[PDB]
Design a protein around this ligand. Structure first.
Ligand SMILES: [Mg+2]
Ligand SMILES: [Mg+2]
Ligand SMILES: [Mg+2]
Ligand SMILES: [Zn+2]
Ligand SMILES: [Zn+2]
Lengths: 38, 166, 94, 131, 136, 141
RNA sequence: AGCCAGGAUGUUGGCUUAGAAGCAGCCAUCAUUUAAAGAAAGCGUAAUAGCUCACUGGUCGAGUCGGCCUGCGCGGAAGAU
C-alpha cells in the first residue's frame, strides 16, 4: 500500500475507488500499484 | 564529482596519445596528397582530388560542397579517382557527438570512446549556451567504415547522447 | 454565415459591463462607415462557440439586432486574461 | 464507424449487386479463420476477381433494410451471425455448395447451410445445377 | 539561470503584484502555459520548468520563455538583525500576474505539448493553465 | 487442415544444407531431428535454383516426420541480383539509393502467382511495387 | 459496457546488427485478400513462437462518451495538563 496525497491510475488495470471517503487505486494486474489517499 | 574526475582523466589520456598505397589518384599511385578537413573520406562513396599549387593533391570526398565550388571555378585541377589499396592505417574520422549535459555525461562518452580499438588523436569540447547541450568533436583514427559505424552505434547506445555523426 | 443574436444596451459603463459578464452575456460594439457606433450585448456562450473556428474571424457575420441583419466582420476581441471567456468584441461593418 | 452517408452508400452498392445476380448462399464464421477466409475469397478471385463481396453486416436495419427493394424473402435470414454472398457471372453458379464443402473440411459451422433464393428454397444440399 | 547581465541598480523595492499581465496571448508559438495564479517565478524555478518541458518534448519543436526574472530579491543572512541596510541579492524573480503566458511551444502535437506543460507546471509555484494560438 | 501445432517459417538460403549458425536450435527445438533439414530439404531445392531463401511449412506431428509444401522466395532477396544494388533502406527519401522500372516488377510478379493470395495479377504487381518502395527503391513508372 | 469469433497475405518490408522475424533500434510505413486486421499499442522470446489491443461482424436493446463551466464538498490535515 502506497499512501500518497496524490493517487493515480498507474496502468489501465488500476481502478480508482472511494471506500469510507478514501480514494484508493486498486489494481488486479499489479499489487504494487494499489494506493491510498493519506 | 567522480564522473568529472573520470572525464578529466580521459581527456588527459587523449592528450598524451596525441602527443603510400592509400589514395591512387587516377591509375597512378604515389602522388603527393592529403585528406581535406571539409569532409574527410575513408572508405567513402567515391573521392575527388583537387590538384593544389603547393602540397600536391587535396582529397575531398565525392559530392562535397567545397569540391563542387572548385569544379565550378575551374574543372581542370580536379581529378576523379579510387580510394587506392586501403591504407594500412586509413586514418581520419572526426565524430561530432551532440548530448544533453548532466553532471557526468562527457566523462561517460569519453569512457565509451576508450576501450574500443580507436586511436584518439584529438578531442574538441564545449557546452553550448543555447541550452545545456554538451557538443564534442573527436578527431580519431580507425581502419574501416564498418569499424566507424560500430563506434557510432556504441556511442548512441549511451542514452544521454542525442546524436553522433561526422 | 454566422447568425449572432444581439440586443442594444440600455446601460453602458464599467459596472454595467461587469453585470452583463456575470449574467452570461458580454458587451460588444459595431462600427464602420457612415453609420454611428452601435453598442450591444452578446449572449456569451454562443459567441464563444462560434469563435472556436477561424471561419468566424475571417468571414462576414450577421449580427441580428432589433430586426436588422447587420453584416459585420469581427475586428478585435478582448479575451479574459486567464479564463476561456470574452470580455468584449469589436465588429466592423462590411 | 462513419455516420449516415457511408452506410447508405454501402447499402446502395449491395442493392446494385443484388440486382445484377441471382443465386446466393450464407456463411457464419463463429469460429472461422483468416486462413479459411482465403478459401472462399480465393475461390471468388479464381472465378473472376474482387466483385464478389462477402459483406458480413447482417443487422436488422442494414443488410435487412436493403432486402425490401429486391427479393423480400431474405428478411428472415437477418438474425444471428450471417454473411451474404451474391453471385454475378453464370445463372446458378457452383458457389452454393462450395461453402458447404468448406464447412465439411474444417470450418466449425456455416450458418447450417440454409441457402438463399432461386425457387425460394431452404436447407437443401442441391447438387443439381448447370455444369 | 536567467538573470540580467547588467543592471542600473543592484537592489529593488518589493513593490506589489496587483493587476493582470500584458503578455497574455500565445504570441510566438502554438501552445502556451498561462499563469492563472498570481505570484513570483524565481529564475531557478523557470529553469526547472524549461528543463521539464524541453525534456518532455525531446528537443522536438521550439520553446519560448516569455517571463524573465528581472527583479532582484534580497535576503538577510541568519542571526542578522533588522537594521544594517537592505540585504544582498540571493536570487532573481519575475512577478507573474494572472494572464502571463510563461512558456510557449510549437513544433509538437497538442497532447505532447500539454504533457510537457504539466511537467513544467509542477515545477512552478503558481497555478497555470494550457492555452492556444487564437486567431485575433 | 489443423490450426497451430508448431508450424513456423524459419530458414536461410535453400542451397546452404544443414544451417547450424543461423537456424540451429530453432529448426530442432521440437522432437524433429537436425537430420531432417538436409536430405528432404534439398530434394525440392534441386528442382529449381540455389542461393535463395524459400519458406516451408513445419507442421510437427508426434510421429517423427512432418508434412511440408514449399511456397515461393521473397522479393527481398530477388531485388539484389535482378534489381542491381544489394543495399537499401537507411536514407530513402533524403537521397535515392536505387530504382526499378514498373515493367520489370510486373514481370517478377507473375512467376510468384502460385503462392500469392491475390485475385488479379495487377493487384499483386502493385503490392510488389509497394514492397519495393518500402525497401527503398522509387519506382520509375 | 459486457459476451462470442477473427485480428491474415507479399512478410523474416528492408536495413543495421552479434541477432532483430509488429516489438535493441533505424528508415520507409505501402498495397493486397478485405466484414476488418498498425509493416503494429502493451505484455512476451536468446530471436522465433505465444498472449492481449486497435480495427472488425455478430450478440444485446438505450443512451453513452469527455471536455470546460462554475456551486458546495472529500483527502492532502501529526503535539504535547
Ligand atoms: Mg475499514
Ligand atoms: Mg467599482
Ligand atoms: Mg479540505
Ligand atoms: Zn496496475
Ligand atoms: Zn571535402
Amino acid at each position: 500500500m502506497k499512501v500518497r496525497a496524490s493517487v493515480k491510475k498507474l496502468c489501465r488495470n488500476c481502478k480508482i475507488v472511494k471506500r469510507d471517503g478514501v480514494i484508493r487505486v486498486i489494481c488486479s494486474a499489479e499489487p504494487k500499484h494499489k494506493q491510498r489517499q493519506g | 564529482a567522480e564522473e568529472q574526475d573520470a572525464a578529466a582523466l580521459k581527456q588527459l589520456q587523449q592528450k598524451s596519445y596525441t602527443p603510400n598505397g592509400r589514395v591512387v589518384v587516377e591509375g597512378v599511385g604515389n602522388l603527393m596528397h592529403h585528406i581535406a578537413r571539409c569532409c574527410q573520406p575513408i572508405p567513402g562513396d567515391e573521392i575527388v582530388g583537387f590538384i593544389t599549387q603547393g602540397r600536391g593533391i587535396s582529397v575531398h570526398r565525392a559530392d562535397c560542397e567545397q569540391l563542387a565550388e572548385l569544379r565550378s571555378h575551374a574543372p581542370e585541377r580536379i581529378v576523379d579517382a579510387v580510394w587506392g589499396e586501403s591504407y594500412s592505417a586509413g586514418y581520419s574520422l572526426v565524430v561530432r557527438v551532440v548530448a544533453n549535459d548532466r553532471s557526468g555525461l562527457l566523462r561517460d562518452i569519453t569512457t565509451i570512446l576508450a576501450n574500443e580499438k580507436v586511436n584518439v588523436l584529438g578531442v574538441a569540447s564545449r557546452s553550448d549556451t543555447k541550452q545545456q547541450l554538451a557538443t564534442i568533436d573527436m578527431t580519431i583514427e580507425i581502419y574501416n567504415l564498418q569499424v566507424l559505424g560500430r563506434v557510432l552505434g556504441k556511442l548512441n547506445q549511451v542514452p544521454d547522447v542525442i546524436d553522433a555523426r561526422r | 454565415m454566422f447568425t449572432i443574436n444581439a440586443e442594444v444596451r440600455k446601460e453602458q459603463g464599467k459596472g454595467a459591463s461587469r453585470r452583463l459578464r456575470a449574467a452570461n452575456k458580454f458587451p460588444a460594439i459595431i462600427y464602420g462607415g457612415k453609420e454611428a457606433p452601435l453598442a450591444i450585448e452578446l449572449d456569451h456562450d454562443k459567441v464563444m462557440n462560434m469563435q472556436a473556428k477561424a471561419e468566424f474571424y475571417s468571414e462576414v457575420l450577421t449580427i441580428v439586432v432589433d430586426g436588422k441583419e447587420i453584416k459585420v466582420k469581427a475586428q478585435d476581441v478582448q479575451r479574459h486574461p486567464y479564463k476561456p471567456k470574452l470580455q468584449h468584441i469589436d465588429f466592423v461593418r462590411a | 464507424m462513419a455516420l449516415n452517408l457511408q452506410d447508405k452508400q454501402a447499402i446502395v452498392a449491395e442493392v446494385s449487386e443484388v440486382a445484377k445476380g441471382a443465386l446466393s448462399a450464407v456463411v457464419a464464421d463463429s469460429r472461422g479463420v483468416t486462413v479459411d477466409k482465403m478459401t472462399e475469397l480465393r475461390k471468388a478471385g479464381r472465378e473472376a476477381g474482387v466483385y464478389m463481396r462477402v459483406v458480413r453486416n447482417t443487422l436488422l436495419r442494414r443488410a435487412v433494410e436493403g432486402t425490401p427493394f429486391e427479393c423480400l424473402k431474405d428478411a428472415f435470414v437477418g438474425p444471428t451471425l450471417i454473411a451474404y454472398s451474391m453471385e454475378h457471372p453464370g445463372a446458378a453458379a457452383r458457389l452454393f455448395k462450395e461453402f458447404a464443402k468448406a464447412n465439411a473440411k474444417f470450418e466449425v459451422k456455416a450458418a447450417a447451410f440454409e441457402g438463399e433464393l432461386i425457387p425460394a428454397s431452404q436447407i437443401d444440399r442441391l447438387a443439381t445445377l448447370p455444369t | 539561470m536567467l538573470q540580467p547581465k547588467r543592471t542600473k541598480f543592484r537592489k529593488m523595492h518589493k513593490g506589489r503584484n496587483r493587476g493582470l499581465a500584458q503578455g497574455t496571448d500565445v504570441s510566438f508559438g502554438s501552445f502556451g502555459l498561462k499563469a492563472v495564479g498570481r505570484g513570483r517565478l524565481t529564475a531557478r524555478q523557470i529553469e526547472a520548468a524549461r528543463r521539464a518541458m524541453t525534456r518532455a518534448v525531446k528537443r522536438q519543436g521550439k520553446i519560448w520563455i516569455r517571463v524573465f526574472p528581472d527583479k532582484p530579491i534580497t535576503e538577510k543572512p541568519l542571526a542578522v538583525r533588522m537594521g544594517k541596510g537592505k540585504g544582498n541579492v540571493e536570487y532573481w524573480v519575475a512577478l507573474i500576474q494572472p494572464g502571463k503566458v510563461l512558456y510557449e511551444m510549437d513544433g509538437v502535437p497538442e497532447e505532447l505539448a500539454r504533457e510537457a506543460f504539466k511537467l513544467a507546471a509542477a515545477k512552478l509555484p503558481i497555478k497555470t493553465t494550457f492555452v492556444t494560438k487564437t486567431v485575433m | 487442415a489443423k490450426k497451430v501445432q508448431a508450424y513456423v517459417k524459419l530458414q536461410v538460403a535453400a542451397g546452404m544444407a544443414n544451417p547450424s549458425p543461423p537456424v540451429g536450435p530453432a529448426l530442432g527445438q521440437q522432437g524433429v531431428n537436425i537430420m531432417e533439414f538436409c536430405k528432404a530439404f534439398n530434394a525440392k531445392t534441386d528442382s529449381i535454383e540455389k542461393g535463395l531463401p524459400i519458406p516451408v511449412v513445419i507442421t510437427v506431428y508426434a510421429d517423427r516426420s512432418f508434412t511440408f509444401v514449399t511456397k515461393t522466395p521473397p522479393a527481398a532477396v530477388l531485388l539484389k541480383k535482378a534489381a542491381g544494388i544489394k543495399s537499401g533502406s537507411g536514407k530513402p527519401n533524403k537521397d535515392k539509393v536505387g530504382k526499378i522500372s514498373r515493367a520489370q516488377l510486373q514481370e517478377i510478379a507473375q512467376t510468384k502467382a502460385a503462392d500469392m493470395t491475390g485475385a488479379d495479377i495487377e493487384a499483386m504487381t502493385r503490392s510488389i511495387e509497394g514492397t519495393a518502395r518500402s525497401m527503398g527503391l522509387v519506382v520509375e513508372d
